[PDB]
Design a protein around this ligand. Structure first.
Ligand code: NN6
Lengths: 199, 254
């Protein structure tokens, strides 16, 4: 392999219905209802994949009115303290779900195909596979401006922030929440073209 | 009768010259590694516009060269220059794809842009020094005298120089890189890079297949083939010229 993405697997055509319908159906099974959905998927660790930055950004965002309109799905496992901190936030709020089991590719595809926003707060990323997989299904990326993530994401494809800085990430999530208009559709298709450009 | 078929085929070839010109011009228009694409299309536009029409009338139909003999040299120079340039543009594109497949790591946008610009500049420089070669190196004349016909200088030194410069060296480069390119085209270490590899491999195959009869029979003539019928010589020449038309058809197919 050469770390390309399979356009014949990560495609929306495998998915059924409208994107809003899929997002509503997915939220329902977590006791939640229609909100603006954010997703992290990766290992929990200090210094590499950036779950610590994302947790701090969430703690910052928890104090503001706009927090009522957000939803957060954290997916992964690893450093036990990060897992406990994540569970703590899951228990404090009903708009936060945490999954610590490994999920199938088909399920993760269904996730990417309804979740509408993926956060990739990495300290360093070589290839940006997660960003391409998300982009190929319409999820808009919010990643730190490191590694191949800045190669992949351009002016009109996502949001970039400085790695390791929680406040900038929380501000980015606020800007993306502000970004929630019908324009999302344009912003989605840009992603889907650029991802195909990295097949 | 005899010449009815000949008129029909000459009309067809004139149409072909025009389609070559137009198709390359279209590919050039949609542009303005797209700089290598532009360089190749420029060389093929120049072939169809300068080289092919004059060969079509003179060498292929039969009308004798009553044009100014001071321009016979310019037509020969354009032919040599543009065909050498087209061959080496195909091989530069081949080198670019082989470096995309094998040298995936260090071939960042900065490096790739630098190398492709160097290759374009070098392509045209070598086409110049091969075309206008017996002038600076000054060891002969560029046309074959003693002929009431406009034919390239068949002097041995220039012949070896120009054919190794235009066909055999680029042929060796493409035969070096073709293995990895074909492997990539078949997914043997995602759909976009495979499509790129397949296009380049087809371009190389048609180049080799289009120019090999002419150069091969141009090497066996000086070795007892003192009578290769010039009808087949011209067929092989124009099969080489049709590469200028097949390259657009191949590019616009991907
Ligand atoms: N219309 C006619 N007759 N074109 C030709 O012969 N070319 C045009 C294309 C070409 C070339 F791109 C590079 C080298 C040669 C060449 C050759 F094959 C034999 C020689 F002895 C000298 C040469 F320069 C040619 C020949």
């Amino acid at each position: 392999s050469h770390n390309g993405i399979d356009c014949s697997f990560w495609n929306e055509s495998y998915l059924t219905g409208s994107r809003d319908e899929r997002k509503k159906s997915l939220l329902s099974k977590f006791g939640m209802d229609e909100g603006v959905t954010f997703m992290f998927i990766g290992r929990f660790d200090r210094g590499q994949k950036g779950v610590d930055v994302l947790l701090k950004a969430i703690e910052i965002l928890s104090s503001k009115k706009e927090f009522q309109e957000m939803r957060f799905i954290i997916i992964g496992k690893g450093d036990p303290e990060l897992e406990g901190w994540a569970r703590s936030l899951e228990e404090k709020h009903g708009n936060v779900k945490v999954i610590t089991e490994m999920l199938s590719r088909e399920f993760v595809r269904e996730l990417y195909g309804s979740v509408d926003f993926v956060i990739i707060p990495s300290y360093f990323e070589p290839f940006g596979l997660v960003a391409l997989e998300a982009m190929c299904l319409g999820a808009i990326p919010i990643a730190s401006a490191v590694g191949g993530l800045r190669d992949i994401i351009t002016n009109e494809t996502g949001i970039l922030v400085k790695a390791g800085d929680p406040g900038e990430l929380a501000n980015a999530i606020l800007k993306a929440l502000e970004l929630s208009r019908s324009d999302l559709s344009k912003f989605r298709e840009n992603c889907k073209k650029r991802a195909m450009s990295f097949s | 009768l005899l010449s009815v078929f000949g008129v029909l085929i000459l009309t067809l070839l004139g149409f072909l010259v025009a389609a070559t010109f137009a198709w390359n011009l279209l590919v050039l228009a949609t542009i303005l590694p797209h700089n290598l694409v532009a360089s190749m299309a420029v060389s093929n536009v120049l072939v169809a516009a300068l080289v092919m029409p004059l060969s079509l009338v003179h060498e292929l139909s039969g009308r004798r060269w009553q044009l100014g003999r001071r321009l016979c040299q310019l037509w020969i120079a354009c032919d040599v220059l543009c065909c050498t340039a087209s061959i080496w543009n195909v091989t530069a594109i081949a080198l670019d794809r082989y470096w995309s497949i094998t040298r995936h790591m260090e071939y960042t946008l900065r490096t790739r842009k630098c190398v492709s610009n160097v290759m374009i500049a070098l392509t045209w420089a070598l086409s110049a020094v091969i075309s206008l070669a017996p002038l600076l190196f000054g060891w002969g004349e560029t046309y074959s005298e003693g002929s009431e016909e406009c034919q390239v200088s068949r002097e041995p030194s220039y012949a070896v120089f120009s054919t190794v410069g235009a066909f055999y060296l680029p042929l060796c480069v493409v035969l070096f890189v073709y293995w990895k390119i074909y492997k990539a085209a078949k997914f043997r270490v995602e759909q976009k890079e495979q499509r790129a590899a397949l296009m380049v491999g087809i371009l190389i195959g048609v180049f080799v297949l289009c120019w090999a009869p002419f150069f091969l029979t141009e090497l066996i003539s000086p070795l007892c083939s003192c009578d290769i019928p010039a009808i087949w010589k011209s067929i092989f020449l124009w099969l080489g010229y049709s590469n200028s038309f097949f390259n657009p058809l191949i590019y616009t197919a991907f």
